[PDB]
């Protein structure tokens, strides 16, 4: 599923990401934009041989199981394919764990490089919430 900007903001809010670990909704929407372009089906191979899955590009080395990533820990206890669903519950649940790991949203390098410190409120501008 390719979400609209405000549609995803609404879905993230409904699943409790708004201000989760202190990160406003716009931070999460901005992260999703640059990680997946709001596309739940996004997958991208990493240089270490792991793969990133879903709207928040969650990796198969630490977080989900894809069956092809040596060293897999599957800390979210989910198949990586569940992170591709039109329902974002699995991605959200796992992102809550990731952002709690100690470095906050810096765990998403695209967030650090492209969202951190910017006017992230712009991402939810005009949305009914
Ligand atoms: Cl957009
Ligand atoms: Cl915001
Ligand atoms: Cl933090
Ligand atoms: Yb990546
Ligand atoms: Yb860690
Ligand atoms: Yb409201």
Domain with residue 26: its CATH number is 1.10.530.10
Resolution in A: 1.7
- Ligand 2 centroid vs 59 CA: distance in angstroms? 25
88: phi > 0 → left, psi -120 to 50 → alpha, else beta; which?
alpha
Is 119 within any annotated ligand binding site? Answer: no
Reading the block at residue 2, the tokens are 């390719």
Give the list of residues 6+ apart from residue 108 with CB closer than 8 angstroms, or none. 31, 35, 56, 57
How many structural domains is the chain composed of? 1
Crossing angle of the two packed helices 5-14 and 25-36, in degrees rounded to 10? 120
Using CA atoms, how far apart are residues 111 and 28, in angstroms rounded to an integer? 8
* Tokens at 97, concatenated: 């764990």
Start-to-end Cα distance in the chain: 21
Range of the structural domain that residue 104 is part of: 1-129
Reply yes or no on whether 66 is catalytic: no
Sign of torsion over alpha carbons 57, 2, 127, 15: negative
Are 91 and 58 in contact by the 8 Å Cβ rule? The answer is yes
Between the CA of 3 and the centroid of ligand 2 the distance, in Å, is 18
Strands 51-53 and 43-45: antiparallel
3-class secondary structure, 105: helix
Closest ligand to Cα 53: 4
What experimental approach yielded this model?
X-ray
Ligand 5 center to residue 7 CA distance, Å? 31
Report the distance separating Cα 129 and Cα 56, nearest Å: 21
18: annotated active-site residue? no
- Asked if 56 and 78 count as a contact pair (C-beta separation under 8 A), the reply is no
* Least distant ligand from the CA of 124: 2
Contact 54, 87 (CB under 8 A): no
- In the three-class reduction of DSSP (H, G, I as helix; E, B as strand; rest coil), residue 16 is classed as coil
Instruction: Please identify which of the residues 7, 18, 52, 87 carries the catalytic annotation.
Output: 52
């Amino acid at each position: 599923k390719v979400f609209g900007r405000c549609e995803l903001a609404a879905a993230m809010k409904r699943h409790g990401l708004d201000n989760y670990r202190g990160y406003s909704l716009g931070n999460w929407v901005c992260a999703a934009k640059f990680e997946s372009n709001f596309n739940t089906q996004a997958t991208n191979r990493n240089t270490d041989g792991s793969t990133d899955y879903g709207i928040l590009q969650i990796n198969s080395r630490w977080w989900c199981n894809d069956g092809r990533t040596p060293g897999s820990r599957n800390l979210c206890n989910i198949p990586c394919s569940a992170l591709l669903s039109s329902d974002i519950t699995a991605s959200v649940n796992c992102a809550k764990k990731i952002v709690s790991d100690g470095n906050g949203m810096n765990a998403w390098v695209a967030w650090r490089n492209r969202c951190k410190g910017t006017d992230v409120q712009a991402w939810i501008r005009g949305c009914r919430l």
